[PDB]
Design a protein around this ligand. Structure first.
Ligand SMILES: [Zn+2]
Ligand SMILES: [Zn+2]
Ligand SMILES: [Zn+2]
Ligand SMILES: [Zn+2]
Lengths: 364, 364
């Protein structure tokens, strides 16, 4: 079995799913590496533990990555299926290191079972889970069978079986509903209504939401690629347009002709416009179309940015009624409700279209 | 009277307060300069017009600043009361230029009557109005009397009297309530509840709100200065802690000893911590007290920043129930309702206190 199994009290203290209020100290990761055949024996199994504070370098997911890099050198270059049972959901830094690892090595596939979710006072925690999902990691809450499997495979049970605790199924249900909500797919209607708006009073909105879709040129028709379809938002300290650029390479598009469409609630500031100019200049097989609900004055060179983005290709347009309705129909968890326009939508669209046409062309 | 009066049709289309949906073109500013004596005759009166797009250098508030700078060199060095009737509220750039002019020149006081509010798709429009108010500008909605006075003093009416339009009062009332809301002074309760919270799930909250109060040391008792008391929030492209430092010189504090207290919904990132350390090093008569609702991990050197701030003086502490309740009582438009704690408030306070005590100190 295992070289040094987990102590039953450690398991009971850490692999549990009832809500608690204490801060984190140590997190545990039970890890199993298998071949491509699910009924093959496990190639290896190891337990990792790490202190949450004060450095993420020592979190068990980082220890796993460093371990796995040396461990894989000692076998043939083959496909691996890795499974983690982890007592708490990973931190943002580790979510990003794992997503990058998965993206750079397609021969590894990862399934992550978490006992409980932790959020780390991170305003961008949701986007960390979403980046893991985009890099191919499967993430589920541990249910009865997984707790019992981790008990059998990793705990020094001394013949004793997994004894469940009271309300285990109920905590599972609540956590899994929470996880599914964090991994949505379709945007919340209140989110759409708070952000995709063009009234000149913007209700103090500093967030930028971005709905994206990709089409491929195939026998001279544009065919949708619905597996690359969704929405994102800005991060604390990283603008939404930059996160969109960071998302694109996870799609691993080939050299065919692609058309990427973004509906963004704010047009790009100058710096994000310049990064988008660089991206489209280095990826000319990719046609970029940006529709903005509002024009963002970054108190600087945003007009130069919009003109530079327009000149390097890229269609830039203000959203009209039709684009708003399309975004609602296509990206919103609307449950059959129709689009509901707000007063002045068409007039503000017309005024903003004029301002944009004036920015392009010239006068400033 | 005046050398160039406004044409009645110009007044009718621009000095009106009914809601409209069109974009802005030209804005009008009727200006009257008087001495400190209300019963003195007006020394001068001038009309300015400016195109809103594409450069704020030509907005009428800027033309007024350039004109007035030359005008006052040619008149007596005395105190002046300036009155503006302006067809729309100023843009951010003009609001800040006027605030700076007012702050650097105490012998001039400005009253601004606006026919209608315009928001320019600016997420920080509220702060522009608020910085105008903190520099001493009085800002009111034009009522019947102000429309009538503007008509008499500035319009080529050819003996005709001011004729009001239908719903002048009702639009006035709606507009003045909106303006009063923009200059609040006391924080809306929903704002407080959405931002001053310490659950480790932060609801993606990227805003930082900051409540401040000032004390004076007088014969070794700490006296409040309730004229320097309020709240602010971050801007697009400028963090809340920087906005607070920018605010402090508007207070024109002398060389006595002052204690400034911040209750912030996020502890400062590294760059803001360093700017605050610079501030307290250049203003040793000002003792700084920071209470944070949550610790903000800026994905960089934020722990060094908190340590530097703590080493340079400056008390850094996490908010407990007592501080939350004090902020509710002191800064919130609570209308007599008591503070309502949320679940886990005390436990999350204790966990964050532990983390902060570990960050100060050391361990990594
Ligand atoms: Zn981590
Ligand atoms: Zn940007
Ligand atoms: Zn202006
Ligand atoms: Zn900061």
């Amino acid at each position: 079995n295992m070289v040094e199994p987990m102590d039953p009290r450690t398991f009971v203290s850490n692999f549990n799913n009832r809500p608690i209020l204490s801060g984190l100290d140590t997190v545990w990761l039970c890890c199993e590496v298998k071949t491509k055949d699910p009924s093959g024996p496990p190639l290896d199994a190891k337990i990792f533990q790490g202190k949450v504070y004060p450095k993420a370098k020592y979190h068990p997911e980082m220890r796993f990555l460093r371990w796995f890099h040396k461990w894989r050198q000692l076998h043939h270059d083959q496909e691996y299926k890795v499974t983690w049972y982890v007592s708490w959901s990973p931190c943002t830094r580790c979510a990003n290191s794992v997503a990058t690892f998965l993206a750079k090595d397609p021969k590894v596939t990862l399934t992550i079972f978490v006992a409980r979710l932790y959020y780390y006072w991170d305003p961008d925690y949701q986007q960390a889970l979403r980046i893991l999902a985009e890099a191919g990691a499967t993430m589920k809450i541990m249910n009865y069978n997984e707790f019992q499997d981790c008990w059998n495979k990793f705990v020094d049970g001394r013949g004793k079986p997994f004894k469940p605790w009271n309300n285990l199924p109920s905590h599972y249900t609540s956590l899994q509903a929470t996880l599914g909500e964090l991994l949505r797919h379709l945007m919340d209607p209140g989110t759409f209504t708070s952000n995709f708006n063009n009234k000149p009073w913007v209700s103090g909105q500093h967030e930028t939401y971005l709905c994206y879709k990709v089409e491929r040129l195939h026998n001279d028709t544009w065919v949708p690629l619905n597996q690359h379809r969704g929405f994102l938002r800005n991060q604390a300290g990283r603008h939404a347009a930059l996160c969109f650029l960071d998302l694109i390479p996870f799609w691993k598009l080939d050299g065919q002709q692609y058309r990427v469409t973004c509906f963004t609630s704010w047009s790009p500031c100058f710096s994000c416009a310049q990064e988008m100019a660089k991206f489209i200049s280095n990826n000319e097989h990719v046609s970029l179309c940006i529709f903005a609900a509002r024009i963002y004055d970054d108190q600087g060179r945003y007009q130069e940015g919009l003109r530079t983005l327009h000149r390097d290709g890229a269609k830039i347009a203000m959203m009209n009624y039709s684009e708003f309705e399309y975004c609602w129909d296509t990206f919103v968890d609307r449950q059959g409700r129709p689009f509901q326009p707000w007063d002045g939508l068409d007039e503000h669209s017309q005024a903003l279209s004029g301002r944009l046409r004036a920015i392009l062309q010239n006068q400033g």
